[PDB]
Ligand binder design. Structure first.
Ligand SMILES: Nc1nc2c(ncn2[C@@H]2O[C@H](COP(=O)(O)OP(=O)(O)CP(=O)(O)O)[C@@H](O)[C@H]2O)c(=O)[nH]1
Ligand SMILES: [Mg+2]
Ligand SMILES: [Mg+2]
Ligand SMILES: [Mg+2]
Length: 301
């Protein structure tokens, strides 16, 4: 089963899930074993804090159960790591708002633009009207691409001149979305990390201005991060989380990367729902995140 997802996690499975079998085979449970396991989790980009938690709970569970063979740790690890992802297994529900405003945050180069386009198409397939806001106002090329895409796919794009105030662009977009009975408004934002302080104050301004029109907006603050960037995805998540209230995460480029274990670090460190995972370039390759599917593909024997 899960043949499709297993293939997309092939490189990650070398170090996590089924990758543990060869590590445990024929060994006993002792300090050396747990030190080996810790190393492999760290190599898999699981993170120091989340790895220590896994080792601590795994050590205690094996001791009180009086386990002897390392192979017996496999089931406890699947449950421990499965729980981490189950805590952030909540699909995004955009129903019942006029419009549902998704504030897309993240740095450049992690797949934010692609995710906007794929989400827009998916919502249209679900019977919804979609509108986009080009809030990345100082990157003329980024604004131009989004406008070209909207005209390709017959989706309205709200944009202003290069250098316009991003909060004002998104304000006008909410007004236009409400006036045109739009179901979902997807607002792009800047992704330049030169000067953390400024970008973060820019996002807080965008949120403040939104609530002039709708105290519920933004209904979703979605971070996009790139699984192939390893711990950079975690530092980026911490940055945007502390600055603005993240409510969802999309993790792209799980396919073809050996660093897919970062998802456990992102899940455990922040507890923010992971809404989608990217496992390909097709529109449908942006899949809703299902913790059970992911664990089963990872730990399948
Ligand atoms: N293998 C893979 N590629 C993906 C995935 N999601 C997006 N991509 C691809 O990664 C590349 C970057 O996507 P993009 O949306 O442009 O990121 P960006 O931050 O907007 C780039 P810029 O800063 O110039 O605007 C693209 O080629 C995109 O098709 C994914 O889930 N898996
Ligand atoms: Mg050792
Ligand atoms: Mg080891
Ligand atoms: Mg872009």
């Amino acid at each position: 089963g899960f043949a499709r997802l297993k293939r997309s996690l092939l490189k990650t499975k070398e170090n996590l899930g089924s990758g543990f079998i060869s590590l445990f085979r024929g060994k006993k449970i002792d300090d050396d074993l747990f030190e080996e396991l810790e190393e492999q989790l760290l190599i898999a980009d699981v993170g120091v804090e989340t790895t220590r938690k896994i080792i601590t709970n795994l050590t205690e569970g094996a001791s009180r159960k009086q386990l002897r063979d390392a192979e017996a740790l496999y089931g406890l690890l699947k449950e421990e790591m499965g729980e981490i992802l189950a805590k952030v297994d909540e699909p995004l529900n955009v129903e019942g708002k006029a419009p549902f405003v998704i504030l897309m945050v993240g740095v450049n180069g992690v797949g934010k633009t692609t995710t906007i386009g794929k989400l827009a198409r998916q919502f249209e397939q679900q019977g919804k009207s979609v509108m986009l806001a080009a809030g990345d106002t100082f990157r003329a090329a980024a604004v131009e691409q989004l406008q070209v895409w909207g005209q390709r796919n017959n989706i309205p794009v709200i944009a202003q001149h290069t250098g316009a105030d991003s909060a004002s662009v998104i304000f006008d977009a909410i007004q236009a979305a409400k006036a045109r009975n739009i179901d979902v408004l997807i607002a792009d934002t800047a992704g330049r990390l030169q000067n953390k302080s400024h970008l973060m104050e820019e996002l807080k301004k965008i949120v403040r201005v939104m609530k002039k029109l709708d105290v519920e907006a933004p209904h979703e603050v979605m971070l996009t991060i790139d699984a192939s960037t390893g711990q950079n995805a975690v530092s980026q998540a911490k940055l945007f989380h502390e600055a603005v209230g993240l409510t969802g995460i999309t993790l792209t480029k799980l396919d073809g990367t050996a660093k897919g274990g970062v998802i456990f670090s992102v899940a455990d460190q922040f507890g923010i729902p992971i809404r989608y995972i990217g496992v390909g370039e097709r529109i449908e390759d942006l899949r809703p995140f299902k913790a059970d599917d992911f664990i089963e593909a990872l730990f399948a024997r």
